[PDB]
Design an enzyme around this catalytic site. Sequence first.
Site, mmCIF file in Angstrom:
data_model
loop_
_atom_site.group_PDB
_atom_site.id
_atom_site.type_symbol
_atom_site.label_atom_id
_atom_site.label_comp_id
_atom_site.label_asym_id
_atom_site.label_seq_id
_atom_site.Cartn_x
_atom_site.Cartn_y
_atom_site.Cartn_z
ATOM 1 C CG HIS A 84 -22.814 39.660 -10.519
ATOM 2 N ND1 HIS A 84 -21.777 38.891 -10.039
ATOM 3 C CD2 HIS A 84 -22.230 40.672 -11.198
ATOM 4 C CE1 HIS A 84 -20.625 39.389 -10.451
ATOM 5 N NE2 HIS A 84 -20.865 40.476 -11.154
ATOM 6 C CG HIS A 86 -21.080 42.697 -14.000
ATOM 7 N ND1 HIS A 86 -20.569 43.064 -12.772
ATOM 8 C CD2 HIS A 86 -21.828 43.738 -14.433
ATOM 9 C CE1 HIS A 86 -20.980 44.290 -12.491
ATOM 10 N NE2 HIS A 86 -21.738 44.725 -13.480
ATOM 11 C CG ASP A 88 -17.449 38.341 -13.886
ATOM 12 O OD1 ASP A 88 -18.521 38.936 -13.956
ATOM 13 O OD2 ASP A 88 -16.788 38.273 -12.834
ATOM 14 C CG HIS A 149 -19.539 43.199 -7.589
ATOM 15 N ND1 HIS A 149 -18.597 44.046 -8.102
ATOM 16 C CD2 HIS A 149 -20.017 42.484 -8.630
ATOM 17 C CE1 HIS A 149 -18.476 43.832 -9.402
ATOM 18 N NE2 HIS A 149 -19.323 42.879 -9.745
ATOM 19 C CG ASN A 180 -16.067 48.734 -13.013
ATOM 20 O OD1 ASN A 180 -16.959 49.483 -12.617
ATOM 21 N ND2 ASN A 180 -15.804 48.547 -14.302
HETATM 22 O O1 LIG Z 1 -15.106 43.432 -9.917
HETATM 23 C C1 LIG Z 1 -15.677 42.471 -10.456
HETATM 24 O O2 LIG Z 1 -15.834 41.423 -9.822
HETATM 25 C C2 LIG Z 1 -16.341 42.651 -11.797
HETATM 26 S S1 LIG Z 1 -17.430 41.314 -12.394
HETATM 27 C C3 LIG Z 1 -16.329 44.014 -12.509
HETATM 28 C C4 LIG Z 1 -16.974 44.029 -13.742
HETATM 29 C C5 LIG Z 1 -17.775 45.114 -13.963
HETATM 30 CL CL1 LIG Z 1 -18.158 46.081 -12.598
HETATM 31 C C6 LIG Z 1 -18.525 45.221 -15.120
HETATM 32 C C7 LIG Z 1 -18.244 44.357 -16.162
HETATM 33 C C8 LIG Z 1 -17.290 43.365 -16.010
HETATM 34 CL CL2 LIG Z 1 -16.923 42.259 -17.354
HETATM 35 C C9 LIG Z 1 -16.593 43.228 -14.826
HETATM 36 CL CL3 LIG Z 1 -15.349 41.977 -14.776
HETATM 37 ZN ZN LIG Z 2 -19.493 41.918 -11.520
HETATM 38 ZN ZN LIG Z 3 -16.494 39.545 -11.112
#
Ligand SMILES: O=C(O)/C(S)=C/c1c(Cl)ccc(Cl)c1Cl
Ligand SMILES: [Zn+2]
Ligand SMILES: [Zn+2]
Length: 234
Positions: A84, A86, A88, A149, A180
């Site tokens: 996805h 984001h 990470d 997510h 989040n």
């Molecule tokens: O809960 C999760 O797996 C992640 S990827 C949350 C997230 C969000 Cl929602 C935005 C930005 C970033 Cl950097 C992260 Cl880490």
């Molecule tokens: Zn994410």
């Molecule tokens: Zn994540």
Amino acid sequence: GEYPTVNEIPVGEVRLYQIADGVWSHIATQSFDGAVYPSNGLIVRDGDELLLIDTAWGAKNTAALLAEIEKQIGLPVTRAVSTHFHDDRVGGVDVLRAAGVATYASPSTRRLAEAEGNEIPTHSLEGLSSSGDAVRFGPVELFYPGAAHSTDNLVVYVPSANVLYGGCAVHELSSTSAGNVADADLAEWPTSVERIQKHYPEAEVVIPGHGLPGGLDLLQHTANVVKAHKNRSV
Ligand SMILES: O=C(O)/C(S)=C/c1c(Cl)ccc(Cl)c1Cl
Ligand SMILES: [Zn+2]
Ligand SMILES: [Zn+2]
């Protein structure tokens, strides 16, 4: 000698963990909005080449990942898929693309990454825009379970090993909330998890995007946590 946890991996270092013959997870840590989190990706052997699933959450971590792969496995990473948009999952794509890795993601992921100011995989993966879609990509199957997510989240299955990599659509057993949910579809997430359960009933190992792998119970646990989250939020 167990799966590494967040307190065991300095930010900037990457560990590999063997999951099955020819399947490893990669584990890194990063700081985000003031807290430190572990994060997983996958490495799958593809002959004398490797397929990488997800970056190690940033340029420096991803450079460390490539070095650790070269040291410990010694086969070239030739392709990578981001599951996805984001950071990470895509942070580090520019490092991969400079190292000669061909980087891929769905068109949805590429467009969301561009809108967010994140690094953008080079190649689009078609055939994944409808919930329940599956496509083959080297030694794995890519599956779009529906919004969870994020609206673009993919899961990855390694049929040779019955390993299911859920990415961030799947939580570890110790998780107590959906995290989040900025980009989440909380109403759809439990249904998307059900699609994964129905499609991959023979999965032996399930790897979440963050935290410890386990068995199939990670899927039901995730649905439970997300429904409870939504209930508490309502
Ligand atoms: O809960 C999760 O797996 C992640 S990827 C949350 C997230 C969000 Cl929602 C935005 C930005 C970033 Cl950097 C992260 Cl880490
Ligand atoms: Zn994410
Ligand atoms: Zn994540």
